[PDB]
Amino acid sequence: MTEYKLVVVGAGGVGKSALTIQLIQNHFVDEYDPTIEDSYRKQVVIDGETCLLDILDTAGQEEYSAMRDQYMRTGEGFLCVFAINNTKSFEDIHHYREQIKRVKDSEDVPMVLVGNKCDLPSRTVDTKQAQDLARSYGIPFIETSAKTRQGVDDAFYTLVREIRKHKEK
């Protein structure tokens, strides 16, 4: 069996934990309990392959930035999450991606852009802005909502597929 090491990154309050918990425990948390670093394991089936997901749910609070250097070397793929109603979360992904490339010394590393809270009617980040930044990065883009579970499985599975494409042949 193959193990995929996924890391979920992004600003605080974006919904990184709510998406992970929706995959692991199949329910939506309405508590906002800021994460330090959480680890989860789950076995799924993806394109007919049974495999293990080793998920690391990281801290969006900037006070814990000294921890980023370690999980970015250990992780194979990265979910970059922003909320579609918070435009500073979109500006923060710039710094996350260019700090993953600096630590891995690679201009191409598995990565998926994720816009969370699509259940919300108010939207300050249009869909064309994220799709255009995703094409700028050669990476997919998936709109998700942890509250309604729309697109959460698509998000993790497309990251696994992006990891498969980065493996030699």
Binding site: Y32, I36, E37, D38, G60, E63, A66, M67, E91
Partner: protein
Amino acid sequence: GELPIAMALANVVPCSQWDELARVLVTLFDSRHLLYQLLWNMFSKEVELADSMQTLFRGNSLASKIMTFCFKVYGATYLQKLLDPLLRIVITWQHVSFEVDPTRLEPSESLEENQRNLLQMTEKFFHAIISSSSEFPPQLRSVCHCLYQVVSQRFPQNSIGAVGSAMFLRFINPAIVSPYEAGILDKKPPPRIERGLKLMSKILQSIANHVLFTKEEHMRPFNDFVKSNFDAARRFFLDIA
């Protein structure tokens, strides 16, 4: 009338440079003995504009960045004198192991014995903090009280919790997880220690947040230790505020 012009001009600074802004605002208003007046406005403008307590000082807003800056500037020497004696005792410490995740546990090591070394270290750190009231720097008590006074205006039943979680999440726990990066130690601890410090900060955060472990399955066995330290933590926060 220095404050109403500084608040008007802060509207202009975009979100990319809130770090420099918080530094500039605090260095400016402290050198004029008006730090308490700046913190009151900023903290009031993030409690009045909150729907509920859940989303209050979370994330990294401008007022949040000002608060973190104050903890780091006025509590720097207090945290190092408080944590340095405890870090050097657990670093130098024979055959201690802190891995409590069964998926990552070495076969030779015991789980129930690794859990007890984590709890033993957590007491020493937790007991040191709640007994440090008399060494608190005065500038830091006014920051904590100002937050407590502001949050109590609209949320009396949650003010004590907000101050404690804020102090642990943006001041103490960052230092424990990365002591070398915070200036406390002169070298990164060995990886076995770094693992324990990170796991311990999680336990301390639960006590400050007054909520039990409900997500990671390997952290639930510490819920009994967490319940027994809620009141002692609220008494320590009631003293600072």
